Design a protein around this ligand. Sequence first.
Ligand SMILES: *[C@@H]1O[C@H](CO[C@@H]2O[C@@H](C)[C@@H](O)[C@@H](O)[C@@H]2O)[C@@H](O)[C@H](O)[C@H]1NC(C)=O
Ligand code: MAN
Ligand code: MAN
Ligand code: CA
Ligand code: CA
Ligand code: CA
Ligand code: CA
Ligand code: CA
Ligand code: CA
Length: 315
Amino acid sequence: QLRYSVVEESEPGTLVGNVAQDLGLKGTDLLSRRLRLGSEENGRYFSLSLVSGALAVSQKIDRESLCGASTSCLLPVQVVTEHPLELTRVEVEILDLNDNSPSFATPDREMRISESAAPGARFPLDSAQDPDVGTNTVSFYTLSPNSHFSLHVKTLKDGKLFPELVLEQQLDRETQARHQLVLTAVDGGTPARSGTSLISVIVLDVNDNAPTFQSSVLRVGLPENTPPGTLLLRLNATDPDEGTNGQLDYSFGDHTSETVKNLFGLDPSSGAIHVLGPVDFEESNFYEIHARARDQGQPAMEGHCVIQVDVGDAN
Ligand SMILES: *[C@@H]1O[C@H](CO[C@@H]2O[C@@H](C)[C@@H](O)[C@@H](O)[C@@H]2O)[C@@H](O)[C@H](O)[C@H]1NC(C)=O
Ligand SMILES: *[C@H]1O[C@H](CO)[C@@H](O)[C@H](O)[C@@H]1O
Ligand SMILES: *[C@H]1O[C@H](CO)[C@@H](O)[C@H](O)[C@@H]1O
Ligand SMILES: [Ca+2]
Ligand SMILES: [Ca+2]
Ligand SMILES: [Ca+2]
Ligand SMILES: [Ca+2]
Ligand SMILES: [Ca+2]
Ligand SMILES: [Ca+2]
Protein backbone atom coordinates (compact mmCIF):
# COMPACT_ATOMS: atom_id res chain seq x y z
CA GLN A 1 0.00 0.00 0.00
CA LEU A 2 2.33 2.73 1.27
CA ARG A 3 6.10 2.32 1.10
CA TYR A 4 8.60 4.56 2.88
CA SER A 5 12.26 4.26 3.85
CA VAL A 6 14.45 5.61 6.64
CA VAL A 7 18.15 5.25 7.48
CA GLU A 8 19.11 3.40 10.66
CA GLU A 9 20.18 5.42 13.74
CA SER A 10 18.67 8.60 12.28
CA GLU A 11 17.97 11.23 14.94
CA PRO A 12 14.35 11.45 16.22
CA GLY A 13 12.28 14.02 14.36
CA THR A 14 13.66 12.78 11.05
CA LEU A 15 11.04 12.85 8.30
CA VAL A 16 9.95 9.43 7.07
CA GLY A 17 7.01 10.16 4.79
CA ASN A 18 4.17 12.61 4.20
CA VAL A 19 1.17 10.36 4.83
CA ALA A 20 -1.45 13.12 4.57
CA GLN A 21 -0.18 14.31 1.19
CA ASP A 22 -0.05 10.75 -0.16
CA LEU A 23 -3.57 10.08 1.14
CA GLY A 24 -5.22 13.24 -0.15
CA LEU A 25 -5.94 14.83 3.23
CA LYS A 26 -5.51 18.60 3.41
CA GLY A 27 -5.50 20.89 6.44
CA THR A 28 -8.84 20.42 8.20
CA ASP A 29 -9.25 16.84 6.95
CA LEU A 30 -6.56 15.73 9.41
CA LEU A 31 -8.61 16.76 12.45
CA SER A 32 -12.03 16.00 10.97
CA ARG A 33 -11.04 12.49 9.88
CA ARG A 34 -8.90 11.96 12.99
CA LEU A 35 -5.50 11.00 11.58
CA ARG A 36 -4.11 8.23 13.79
CA LEU A 37 -1.63 5.38 14.04
CA GLY A 38 -2.86 1.79 14.45
CA SER A 39 -1.98 1.11 18.09
CA GLU A 40 0.35 2.20 20.89
CA GLU A 41 2.97 -0.22 19.55
CA ASN A 42 2.94 1.58 16.20
CA GLY A 43 4.05 4.85 17.78
CA ARG A 44 7.04 3.31 19.54
CA TYR A 45 9.49 4.43 16.86
CA PHE A 46 7.26 6.72 14.81
CA SER A 47 5.07 9.80 15.20
CA LEU A 48 2.24 11.08 13.03
CA SER A 49 1.47 14.79 13.29
CA LEU A 50 -2.07 16.16 13.16
CA VAL A 51 -0.59 19.50 12.13
CA SER A 52 1.94 18.66 9.41
CA GLY A 53 0.50 15.27 8.45
CA ALA A 54 4.04 13.96 8.23
CA LEU A 55 5.18 10.61 9.60
CA ALA A 56 8.54 10.97 11.33
CA VAL A 57 10.95 9.11 13.63
CA SER A 58 9.98 9.14 17.31
CA GLN A 59 12.79 7.01 18.73
CA LYS A 60 16.30 6.33 17.42
CA ILE A 61 16.04 3.09 15.45
CA ASP A 62 18.64 0.31 15.50
CA ARG A 63 18.35 -2.08 12.55
CA GLU A 64 20.55 -4.58 14.39
CA SER A 65 17.87 -4.62 17.09
CA LEU A 66 14.83 -5.13 14.87
CA CYS A 67 15.88 -7.32 11.94
CA GLY A 68 19.21 -8.62 13.22
CA ALA A 69 20.88 -10.28 10.24
CA SER A 70 17.87 -10.16 7.92
CA THR A 71 18.49 -8.84 4.40
CA SER A 72 15.41 -6.61 4.47
CA CYS A 73 13.92 -4.88 7.51
CA LEU A 74 10.25 -4.00 7.01
CA LEU A 75 8.41 -2.15 9.77
CA PRO A 76 4.60 -2.29 9.31
CA VAL A 77 2.31 0.38 10.79
CA GLN A 78 -1.40 1.13 10.39
CA VAL A 79 -2.80 4.58 9.60
CA VAL A 80 -6.48 5.01 10.48
CA THR A 81 -8.62 7.73 8.89
CA GLU A 82 -12.31 8.14 9.77
CA HIS A 83 -15.26 9.31 7.66
CA PRO A 84 -15.18 6.88 6.06
CA LEU A 85 -13.34 4.58 8.47
CA GLU A 86 -10.44 3.16 6.47
CA LEU A 87 -7.09 1.70 7.53
CA THR A 88 -3.92 2.07 5.46
CA ARG A 89 -0.87 -0.19 5.46
CA VAL A 90 2.45 1.63 5.74
CA GLU A 91 5.71 -0.26 5.26
CA VAL A 92 8.80 1.56 6.52
CA GLU A 93 12.07 -0.03 5.41
CA ILE A 94 14.99 0.50 7.78
CA LEU A 95 18.05 1.01 5.58
CA ASP A 96 21.23 -0.53 7.01
CA LEU A 97 24.01 1.78 8.18
CA ASN A 98 27.67 0.79 8.46
CA ASP A 99 27.93 1.74 12.13
CA ASN A 100 29.30 -1.58 13.41
CA SER A 101 32.99 -2.48 13.31
CA PRO A 102 34.36 -6.05 12.90
CA SER A 103 34.98 -7.64 16.31
CA PHE A 104 37.03 -10.51 17.72
CA ALA A 105 36.18 -12.63 20.77
CA THR A 106 39.58 -11.76 22.23
CA PRO A 107 42.12 -9.05 21.28
CA ASP A 108 45.13 -11.34 21.77
CA ARG A 109 45.41 -15.07 21.04
CA GLU A 110 48.10 -17.64 21.76
CA MET A 111 48.64 -20.61 19.46
CA ARG A 112 50.86 -23.56 20.32
CA ILE A 113 52.19 -25.43 17.30
CA SER A 114 54.54 -28.41 17.33
CA GLU A 115 58.01 -27.84 15.88
CA SER A 116 57.61 -31.00 13.79
CA ALA A 117 54.58 -29.59 11.97
CA ALA A 118 54.97 -30.30 8.26
CA PRO A 119 54.54 -27.43 5.76
CA GLY A 120 51.08 -27.23 4.21
CA ALA A 121 49.46 -27.75 7.60
CA ARG A 122 46.33 -25.69 8.21
CA PHE A 123 45.26 -24.20 11.55
CA PRO A 124 41.77 -22.68 11.90
CA LEU A 125 41.39 -19.15 13.27
CA ASP A 126 38.71 -17.39 15.30
CA SER A 127 36.49 -15.59 12.79
CA ALA A 128 35.37 -12.00 13.31
CA GLN A 129 31.78 -10.80 13.67
CA ASP A 130 29.93 -7.80 12.23
CA PRO A 131 26.17 -7.44 12.96
CA ASP A 132 25.70 -5.20 9.90
CA VAL A 133 24.01 -6.66 6.82
CA GLY A 134 25.04 -6.76 3.15
CA THR A 135 28.51 -5.52 2.23
CA ASN A 136 28.60 -3.67 5.55
CA THR A 137 29.55 -6.92 7.29
CA VAL A 138 33.01 -8.55 7.31
CA SER A 139 34.45 -8.33 3.79
CA PHE A 140 37.95 -9.81 4.07
CA TYR A 141 40.83 -10.79 6.34
CA THR A 142 44.49 -9.79 6.11
CA LEU A 143 47.50 -11.41 7.76
CA SER A 144 50.63 -9.43 8.60
CA PRO A 145 53.68 -10.27 6.44
CA ASN A 146 55.72 -13.10 7.96
CA SER A 147 58.18 -15.82 6.99
CA HIS A 148 56.39 -19.03 7.98
CA PHE A 149 52.62 -18.52 7.88
CA SER A 150 50.07 -17.63 5.19
CA LEU A 151 46.39 -16.65 5.19
CA HIS A 152 43.65 -18.77 3.64
CA VAL A 153 40.05 -17.55 3.74
CA LYS A 154 37.39 -20.00 2.56
CA THR A 155 33.82 -19.03 1.69
CA LEU A 156 31.13 -20.99 3.54
CA LYS A 157 27.52 -21.95 2.81
CA ASP A 158 26.30 -19.25 5.20
CA GLY A 159 28.32 -16.79 3.14
CA LYS A 160 30.55 -16.29 6.15
CA LEU A 161 34.32 -16.16 5.77
CA PHE A 162 36.47 -18.83 7.40
CA PRO A 163 40.11 -17.77 7.91
CA GLU A 164 42.95 -20.19 8.64
CA LEU A 165 46.74 -20.19 8.89
CA VAL A 166 48.79 -22.22 6.42
CA LEU A 167 52.34 -23.31 7.24
CA GLU A 168 54.73 -22.25 4.47
CA GLN A 169 58.07 -23.13 6.08
CA GLN A 170 59.33 -25.70 8.58
CA LEU A 171 59.27 -24.19 12.07
CA ASP A 172 62.41 -24.26 14.21
CA ARG A 173 62.30 -23.60 17.96
CA GLU A 174 66.10 -23.33 18.05
CA THR A 175 65.96 -20.18 15.93
CA GLN A 176 62.83 -18.42 17.19
CA ALA A 177 60.52 -19.89 19.84
CA ARG A 178 57.80 -17.32 19.11
CA HIS A 179 56.10 -15.78 16.08
CA GLN A 180 53.78 -12.80 16.21
CA LEU A 181 51.05 -12.19 13.65
CA VAL A 182 48.38 -9.52 13.26
CA LEU A 183 45.05 -10.75 11.91
CA THR A 184 42.90 -7.90 10.62
CA ALA A 185 39.21 -8.21 9.75
CA VAL A 186 37.85 -5.51 7.45
CA ASP A 187 34.27 -4.86 6.32
CA GLY A 188 33.10 -3.54 2.95
CA GLY A 189 32.10 -0.01 3.86
CA THR A 190 33.28 3.43 2.77
CA PRO A 191 35.23 4.27 4.80
CA ALA A 192 35.95 0.67 5.81
CA ARG A 193 35.91 -0.31 9.48
CA SER A 194 38.16 -2.97 11.00
CA GLY A 195 39.27 -5.00 14.00
CA THR A 196 42.46 -6.80 15.01
CA SER A 197 43.52 -9.97 16.78
CA LEU A 198 47.13 -10.47 17.84
CA ILE A 199 48.24 -14.08 17.43
CA SER A 200 51.23 -15.38 19.36
CA VAL A 201 52.49 -18.64 17.86
CA ILE A 202 54.41 -20.65 20.45
CA VAL A 203 56.70 -23.26 18.91
CA LEU A 204 56.57 -26.38 21.10
CA ASP A 205 59.87 -28.25 21.39
CA VAL A 206 60.42 -31.48 19.48
CA ASN A 207 63.49 -33.71 19.84
CA ASP A 208 64.72 -33.02 16.31
CA ASN A 209 68.34 -32.37 17.28
CA ALA A 210 71.06 -34.91 18.07
CA PRO A 211 73.94 -34.32 20.51
CA THR A 212 77.16 -33.08 18.91
CA PHE A 213 80.72 -33.42 20.20
CA GLN A 214 83.05 -30.42 20.18
CA SER A 215 85.35 -32.40 17.89
CA SER A 216 84.24 -35.05 15.41
CA VAL A 217 87.67 -36.68 15.72
CA LEU A 218 90.01 -36.47 18.72
CA ARG A 219 93.61 -37.67 18.97
CA VAL A 220 95.58 -37.89 22.22
CA GLY A 221 98.88 -39.45 23.29
CA LEU A 222 99.68 -40.97 26.68
CA PRO A 223 102.94 -42.29 28.20
CA GLU A 224 103.45 -46.03 28.63
CA ASN A 225 103.85 -45.71 32.41
CA THR A 226 100.42 -44.15 32.98
CA PRO A 227 98.90 -45.57 36.22
CA PRO A 228 95.20 -46.46 36.66
CA GLY A 229 92.88 -43.57 37.52
CA THR A 230 94.77 -41.16 35.27
CA LEU A 231 92.62 -38.60 33.45
CA LEU A 232 92.80 -39.10 29.68
CA LEU A 233 90.27 -36.47 28.57
CA ARG A 234 86.75 -35.16 29.15
CA LEU A 235 84.08 -35.19 26.44
CA ASN A 236 81.98 -32.11 25.65
CA ALA A 237 78.71 -32.74 23.80
CA THR A 238 75.85 -30.23 23.50
CA ASP A 239 72.14 -30.39 22.66
CA PRO A 240 70.08 -27.31 21.65
CA ASP A 241 66.74 -28.95 22.50
CA GLU A 242 64.69 -28.21 25.62
CA GLY A 243 64.50 -30.17 28.88
CA THR A 244 65.09 -33.92 28.77
CA ASN A 245 65.52 -33.58 25.01
CA GLY A 246 68.64 -31.53 25.71
CA GLN A 247 70.26 -33.70 28.37
CA LEU A 248 72.60 -36.54 27.40
CA ASP A 249 74.45 -39.62 28.65
CA TYR A 250 77.89 -40.75 27.45
CA SER A 251 78.67 -44.37 26.57
CA PHE A 252 80.89 -46.61 24.43
CA GLY A 253 79.89 -47.78 20.97
CA ASP A 254 77.99 -51.05 20.53
CA HIS A 255 80.85 -52.55 18.54
CA THR A 256 83.50 -51.49 21.06
CA SER A 257 85.93 -54.33 21.78
CA GLU A 258 86.22 -55.85 25.26
CA THR A 259 89.92 -54.94 25.35
CA VAL A 260 89.11 -51.22 25.22
CA LYS A 261 86.23 -51.68 27.66
CA ASN A 262 88.61 -53.32 30.13
CA LEU A 263 91.39 -50.79 29.52
CA PHE A 264 89.34 -47.58 29.62
CA GLY A 265 86.20 -46.53 31.47
CA LEU A 266 83.95 -43.51 30.99
CA ASP A 267 81.57 -41.71 33.35
CA PRO A 268 78.11 -41.54 31.68
CA SER A 269 77.55 -38.13 33.31
CA SER A 270 80.72 -36.02 33.30
CA GLY A 271 82.07 -37.68 30.16
CA ALA A 272 85.49 -38.05 31.76
CA ILE A 273 87.45 -41.04 30.48
CA HIS A 274 89.93 -42.75 32.80
CA VAL A 275 92.40 -45.55 32.11
CA LEU A 276 91.72 -48.63 34.25
CA GLY A 277 94.39 -51.09 33.14
CA PRO A 278 98.12 -50.98 32.27
CA VAL A 279 99.31 -49.84 28.83
CA ASP A 280 102.41 -50.90 26.92
CA PHE A 281 103.84 -50.46 23.42
CA GLU A 282 104.27 -54.23 23.30
CA GLU A 283 100.54 -54.87 23.54
CA SER A 284 99.35 -52.24 21.06
CA ASN A 285 100.70 -48.92 19.80
CA PHE A 286 97.29 -47.58 18.82
CA TYR A 287 93.81 -47.68 20.35
CA GLU A 288 90.69 -46.24 18.72
CA ILE A 289 87.76 -45.50 21.05
CA HIS A 290 84.21 -44.87 19.81
CA ALA A 291 82.45 -42.34 22.04
CA ARG A 292 78.67 -41.91 21.92
CA ALA A 293 76.36 -39.27 23.42
CA ARG A 294 72.79 -40.52 23.80
CA ASP A 295 69.79 -38.20 24.14
CA GLN A 296 67.30 -38.51 27.00
CA GLY A 297 64.40 -37.81 24.65
CA GLN A 298 61.77 -39.75 22.72
CA PRO A 299 62.73 -40.92 20.20
CA ALA A 300 66.34 -40.93 21.37
CA MET A 301 68.97 -39.10 19.35
CA GLU A 302 72.70 -39.81 19.47
CA GLY A 303 75.97 -38.22 18.42
CA HIS A 304 79.25 -39.99 17.72
CA CYS A 305 82.89 -39.17 18.44
CA VAL A 306 86.17 -40.90 17.60
CA ILE A 307 89.12 -40.79 19.99
CA GLN A 308 92.61 -41.76 18.83
CA VAL A 309 95.05 -42.98 21.48
CA ASP A 310 98.79 -43.25 20.74
CA VAL A 311 100.91 -45.18 23.24
CA GLY A 312 104.59 -44.55 23.99
CA ASP A 313 107.35 -47.16 24.02
CA ALA A 314 108.63 -49.32 26.88
CA ASN A 315 112.12 -48.90 28.36
C1 LIG B 1 81.83 -27.21 25.09
O1 LIG B 1 81.34 -26.96 23.77
C2 LIG B 1 80.58 -25.75 23.67
C3 LIG B 1 79.96 -25.72 22.29
O2 LIG B 1 80.92 -25.57 21.25
C4 LIG B 1 80.16 -25.52 20.03
O3 LIG B 1 79.42 -26.70 19.81
C5 LIG B 1 80.16 -27.85 19.35
C6 LIG B 1 79.15 -28.98 19.23
C7 LIG B 1 80.88 -27.55 18.04
O4 LIG B 1 79.93 -27.26 17.02
C8 LIG B 1 81.82 -26.35 18.24
O5 LIG B 1 82.36 -26.02 16.96
C9 LIG B 1 81.05 -25.14 18.81
O6 LIG B 1 81.94 -24.07 19.11
C10 LIG B 1 81.51 -24.57 23.95
O7 LIG B 1 80.77 -23.36 23.84
C11 LIG B 1 82.08 -24.71 25.35
O8 LIG B 1 83.03 -23.68 25.59
C12 LIG B 1 82.76 -26.07 25.52
N1 LIG B 1 83.19 -26.26 26.90
C13 LIG B 1 84.47 -26.33 27.28
C14 LIG B 1 85.49 -26.21 26.18
O9 LIG B 1 84.79 -26.49 28.45
C1 MAN C 1 41.49 -1.67 10.05
O1 MAN C 1 41.39 -1.24 8.71
C2 MAN C 1 40.81 0.06 8.53
C3 MAN C 1 40.69 0.31 7.04
O2 MAN C 1 41.73 -0.43 6.39
C4 MAN C 1 41.70 1.09 9.24
O3 MAN C 1 41.14 2.38 9.08
C5 MAN C 1 41.80 0.74 10.74
O4 MAN C 1 42.63 1.68 11.41
C6 MAN C 1 42.28 -0.70 10.94
O5 MAN C 1 43.67 -0.70 10.59
C1 MAN D 1 45.02 -4.93 16.88
O1 MAN D 1 45.04 -3.54 17.03
C2 MAN D 1 44.16 -3.05 18.05
C3 MAN D 1 44.16 -1.54 17.97
O2 MAN D 1 43.44 -1.17 16.79
C4 MAN D 1 44.64 -3.59 19.40
O3 MAN D 1 43.81 -3.09 20.44
C5 MAN D 1 44.59 -5.12 19.37
O4 MAN D 1 45.05 -5.65 20.61
C6 MAN D 1 45.38 -5.68 18.18
O5 MAN D 1 46.76 -5.51 18.52
CA1 CA E 1 23.41 -0.16 15.02
CA1 CA F 1 23.89 -1.42 10.85
CA1 CA G 1 30.22 -3.03 9.57
CA1 CA H 1 64.35 -27.69 14.88
CA1 CA I 1 63.82 -28.82 18.98
CA1 CA J 1 68.11 -33.47 21.43
